[PDB]
């Protein structure tokens, strides 16, 4: 029955008392927020720079002692998103930021709703990255947690104190998937506290865990280096007399192995702790260089009766053939219960981690 | 007859009754919004990023029961796009953005059409980096769909419904081509919605279906690897008695094949889920790793006649013939059928997806 | 003899008549625009996104019936760039565009001139990304031509229609050079138009034409191909009896041809239609497979002569030799006729595009 | 007991004789500004175009004899942060700068408060990508300093002296790791100045220490380097008569050398001065490149010998016997020594430094 | 004795008449700017986009009849950095720039000075990317010359002309470095014009002088090549009867000289003229090609000797000997005058340039 310009225009107006620049119920109890997230699509990780985007909705809802109309017969009013400047929005930033811009497209994505008790809503959807510092002690399993702290910034904690909500506390967008990882349902939420000199500041965050859908490091670094240890079991099943191929072979699965490794760090960034990876890398290089240097004893028994030349003839040619048929046959089951003492001590980290 | 600076500051004034914070027809039915989407520029799609650059010009149309003039003779009224903060803008954004900035060369790229009745247009060029969840199960073909979700940020559904057109849906520019993709001329629409914690908001789509043009990766990949089989069934034409040779060759073959095989998932992001080209890949490294296995299984049978060195001496020597002979028969009529089958299957799942 | 300040003030102010929100001699003819393009700075075309950075001056000249004070002694008045709110530019927007800043550097770089009769002046540098859709059919002539279309955006073609001019129509700078292309010219100019479903729309163009300057591509690309048909030639004049070199000669020759094929096309952006210079690689290597392919037949009969091991005897190496000699003769004049015919066909349609 | 509005439009105001534009105590003495430094979250070094991004807090406190309330009973009053534009901030720039933006999330991260006396804090959370001039004598050691340069920008050192504070000086994040460098305790600050030809301005630092976490660089370049001195060992330990193999292997070593040696650059900028690393390479480099000299000097020996096919017969193979067995005892010892003179000579520039 | 907030209300305000709208001693001489060049951090060429980035300061002084307060008994006074839209700054932009923005960290970084007569003082550090056209004719030696071209835009030169000063043109900070080249003390600088369609406008310009601090091509692409000439005299310093080897090796280092060359020309942007070191990559591979002829036709002499299997066998034989040893003795000394004719023509260019 009243006009909806008079209303807007008394409300949060200068005829009326209303301050946007002080705290309500000031000199009293600090004023509770009670924040919501909705992750709308998670993504672009960085893992060389440890980082990662992420657009959150922030849904922040407090009540104020002032605007309370209790005069229209409805229960929550909805407000135009650009009178948002004498609304007395809390303060609120990011520990781990980078860039982190606003969304200006056709009209302000920002949203006000005020009740008749003065609960409030406030969404502003922001395109986020935030770096996250994670620890890389495996590369396969990767697992990772990704963190965000909500704080204030100019209030303290006997002056305005940030909680989180009950019914929800962490959602997610319906059907989101992502290429790297996979996202955990179990939303590890708490709330830390700052102490820095000049008071107590309030400091909520929530943590994320992420953790490596395996296939994709299968391919690009366990098949190849399977095929090379195979290629220097090939060389072992090859005639002792011919010395050019051999020594190619094996010089050739050695580089190989060499350039792969190396490639296989490119997309890592520096560190200094070693790496699953690399250990795999200079297991699999140790039996190629081993490979290599057992041809080179048995050449050199071979030379050593070539320089010589009746039963000591016999015996060196007698050794090389078992010095050759027990490398044959002691390779592959060395390198069969290495990769399942390694795979088993990985399967139980994976599963304690 | 009256002069056109009085009509201009009349209307959407402040000598009227017109508010621009308020909805028109306010406390009543919902406003009908008709967009049309003009495609300009469509390209720069990101696959190792999933999105994609579009510029569209996001023409929308409604009614209002105020600004009907109803006392100029023509039918429709050009105003000026530095008055748009009193118009009363509509809220749309989309659910998949990156970005997305507006466009501000020489004068605002804004346009503001009004007729007698009400009849707005409201299009403004805006530049959007849209990501697209493209599902890649076989990359040459790579059949994909990309999508925008037209929604509205603080107008319920029972508040502030979208809807299409029927005169033409979404245009495209004339003379568009892309150099990766084609466009389908089916552009395939229909409409989801939205259920937050807040309400239900509308949620209108357009989907876009975008194929492969074929020939590149037929250059890149698929006849390199061909000229690699063929090398392979050249070491098949070649002496047995020659050792150093073969070796090299057969060990060439497969170093290339899996040099080649880990830059053609260069410009891929990391995926989990094998692809088409992998298992050509896979394929085509069995045969060359198959053809050196098999050149070891010969040579080892030569080594055992030379060890042993009449009839099982010519029996031998025969079988090295016979095997040699028979592998390179059998080697190109396996390869032969693999290429049929793997392209039947392929092109029959190009018609089915 | 009367200040400047009061003339200012009346002019384009709010105590005379003048409206800056509408278009001159309102409900008549429309206005013409004179626009002419001085280019500043050429260069930087991408040719991976096809797009170029150039940022031009665009001056543009219009008649209006007011602010005609013809009062002044003098010709025309300049006027300050900080009072171009009020002078009622026109509207002007590219078609291709990729950002497309402004510069503000000290002060505004705006330009702002009137005359007594009412020609102004209004030029402003802006730094535009011009997306260019260019056909690269043959790549190392690569013909190609640049575009930019001027258009109206809210004025209609019976409500504003732009023009070029007669003296002198699209100026360079003074000593522009481009180390990729060279500047044509000269300067193909006319203009298109536009009909949406809102009406007809201006919309002036301008072609320019560049040209690749030779030389780069000869030392990159050619150059290294010939020293690999060479070394083949070297693999001819070599002793047939030696097995393991000419295989590790003509493997050799093969993977350089394949790397060197690859990496030469790692610039060019994914295309489907094959390109002069894929002809080229494959034609070369082709040659160097055939080498390769001739010593495995002469292989092969050399060594059914050592199986076989009078009369047959001798002609199967006279045999070799011939076919050798024949190969050695025969490889040079078809390498020479294709270059030959190669270069004639690509000069005739060098000077035909 | 009095409003807060009132005594918030009253003090700052236009009824006050505040005037935000000029310094407090006017023609007397300078005002010092206390500045401290919380570091938020330092990292992502760029090493090849030497700069650091940094995120401070920039707390800043200073006296004027205006604003003094000396009215309210508590100690110190909390202000809003959206009436900064009427507090006199000082002026304050980074003489080392690229970008630097602010930060503007959800509301604005700036603090001011004030006391009964005067003492204000005004901090704000800037990301800083400094530019830092880097010396890099030695590259795997890489001691580095990292600087940045307070400075004001139109105010001398007899209108506004800046300095540091007493109690703490530079501040970091509580569990603040970096993956490339460690943060050094020490925090080294002191103070230069300007002398432009303006006039004397004045200009506080403070500098940082961080070391290279060592790990990385002997993976990624010292251990496979080792492998290649082994691998030339390895033909050290192989029959002479064979020609093709140890000539392959000795190329094989030297190629990787180079390859690797390249590579290890690659991160690196272009820089004159020889670097640490490239010593350790070129030394490598010559014990491979020396091996293959060596076995060129013996063929040429067992050549002789063979040309010449008694007493000097059998001397020659004693020598071509005695050069290698004296070049595989040789050479270990040589590049044992000089492994131990490299870290030794390290260690105690990595001490001295 | 005078109030400052009247003092500085009353100058350059609305009730005197003062208009920042025109220029000073209007319809007169025109107004002199004297500027001066502060570089704070030269550094960031990229020579691949032909640009650089560079801050400078850019200070410029002028006189104004108005603004003569002469009641104050001091020389200068310091105006606050804020009230900078009235003083009426000149034109001035830069005829070669890319982005160019302001710096803006905690406060604005101006600078405004006021004397008694009138001149003033005005500096802005301004982050530049100037474009540079550099000319390549010699790539290790890369003689360079970099300039800016400050010139108006609005103000011709009968309206405004630009100067320069004469105490002090351009100066440099103090201690500052760069990587890559090093800066000449000359500091050469004179002035252009510019001609344009709309009248004649002042451009002032000033050149630098960058050479090429040597050092890191002669290990990067000198040292290596090197490598491979000794490479091709230890091909030289073997047994002719072994065939293997010796191609392989002659192979190898025709490989390498090519890869190396591609990679290169990598860093360097697409150009046509053939630069120095084409020149010398040309030249080297020229020798290993030679080298690998030499063994070719050694190898085809010695065959013939074999097919032909007295007199002629031992001079076919002695002939071998003889260019085998001929040409180890002129390779090196054709390769040594090369490398003396080459560097002392490069020096003498060096110090003609
Ligand atoms: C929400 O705010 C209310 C007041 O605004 C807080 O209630 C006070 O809390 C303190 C500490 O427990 C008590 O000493 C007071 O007596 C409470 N006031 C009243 C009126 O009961 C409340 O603690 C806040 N909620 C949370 C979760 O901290
Ligand atoms: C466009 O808006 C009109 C009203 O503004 C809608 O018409 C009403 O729709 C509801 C639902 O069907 C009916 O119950 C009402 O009776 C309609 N009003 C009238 C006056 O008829 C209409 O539905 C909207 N168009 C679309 C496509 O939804
Ligand atoms: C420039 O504008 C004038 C009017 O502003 C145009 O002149 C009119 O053009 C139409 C179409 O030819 C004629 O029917 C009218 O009679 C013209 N008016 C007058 C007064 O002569 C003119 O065409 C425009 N110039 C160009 C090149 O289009
Ligand atoms: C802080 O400021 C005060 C004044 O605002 C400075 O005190 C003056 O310093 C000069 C130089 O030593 C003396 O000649 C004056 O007599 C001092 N004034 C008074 C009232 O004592 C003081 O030096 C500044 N602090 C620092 C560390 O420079
Ligand atoms: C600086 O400005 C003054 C005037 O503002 C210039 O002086 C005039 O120059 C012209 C050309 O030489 C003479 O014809 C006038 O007679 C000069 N005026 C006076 C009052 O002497 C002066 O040339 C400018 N400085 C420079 C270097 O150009």
């Given at each position: 029955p009243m006009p909806p310009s008079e209303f807007?225009?008394?409300?949060?107006?200068?005829?009326?008392?209303?301050?946007?620049?002080?705290?309500?119920?000031?000199?009293?109890?600090?004023?509770?927020?009670?924040?919501?997230?909705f992750?709308?699509?998670?993504?672009?990780?960085?893992?060389?720079?440890?980082?990662?985007?992420?657009?959150?909705?922030?849904?922040?809802?407090?009540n104020d002692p002032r605007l309370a109309y209790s005069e229209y017969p409805d229960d929550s009013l909805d407000l135009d998103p650009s009178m948002l400047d004498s609304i007395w929005k809390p303060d609120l930033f990011f520990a781990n930021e980078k860039g982190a811009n606003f969304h200006e497209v056709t009209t302000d994505n920002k949203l006000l709703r005020i009740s008749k008790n003065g609960n409030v809503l406030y969404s502003i959807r922001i395109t986020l990255v935030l770096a996250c510092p994670m620890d890389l002690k495996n590369f396969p399993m990767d697992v990772q947690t990704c963190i965000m702290q909500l704080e204030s910034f100019g209030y303290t904690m006997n002056d305005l104190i940030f909680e989180w909500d009950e019914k929800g506390a962490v959602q997610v967008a319906d059907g989101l998937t992502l290429p790297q990882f996979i996202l955990k349902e179990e939303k590890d939420l708490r709330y830390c506290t700052k102490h820095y000199?000049?008071?107590?500041?309030?400091?909520?965050?929530?943590?994320?865990?992420?953790?490596?859908?395996?296939?994709?490091?299968?391919?690009?670094?366990?098949?190849?280096?399977?095929?090379?240890?195979?290629?220097?079991?090939?060389?072992?099943?090859?005639?002792?007399?011919?010395?050019?191929?051999?020594?190619?072979?094996?010089?050739?699965?050695?580089?190989?192995?060499?350039?792969?490794?190396?490639?296989?760090?490119?997309?890592?960034?520096?560190?200094?702790?070693?790496?699953?990876?690399?250990?795999?890398?200079?297991?699999?290089?140790?039996?190629?260089?081993?490979?290599?240097?057992?041809?080179?004893?048995?050449?050199?028994?071979?030379?050593?009766?070539?320089?010589?030349?009746?039963?000591?003839?016999?015996?060196?040619?007698?050794r090389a053939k078992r010095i050759d048929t027990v490398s044959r046959v002691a390779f592959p089951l060395v390198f069969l219960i290495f990769n399942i003492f390694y795979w088993i001590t990985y399967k139980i980290i994976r599963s304690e981690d």
């Open positions: 807007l225009d008394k409300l949060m107006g200068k005829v009326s008392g209303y301050d946007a620049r002080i705290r309500p119920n000031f000199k009293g109890p600090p004023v509770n927020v009670t924040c919501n997230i992750i709308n699509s998670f993504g672009s990780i960085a893992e060389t720079t440890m980082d990662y985007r992420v657009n959150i909705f922030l849904r922040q809802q407090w000199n000049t008071g107590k500041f309030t400091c909520i965050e929530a943590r994320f865990h992420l953790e490596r859908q395996m296939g994709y490091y299968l391919i690009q670094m366990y098949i190849p280096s399977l095929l090379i240890v195979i290629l220097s079991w090939v060389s072992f099943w090859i005639n002792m007399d011919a010395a050019p191929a051999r020594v190619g072979l094996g010089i050739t699965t050695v580089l190989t192995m060499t350039t792969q490794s190396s490639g296989s760090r490119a997309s890592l960034p520096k560190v200094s702790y070693v790496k699953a990876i690399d250990i795999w890398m200079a297991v699999c290089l140790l039996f190629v260089f081993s490979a290599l240097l057992e041809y080179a004893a048995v050449n050199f028994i071979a030379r050593q009766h070539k320089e010589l030349l009746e039963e000591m003839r016999k015996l060196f040619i007698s």
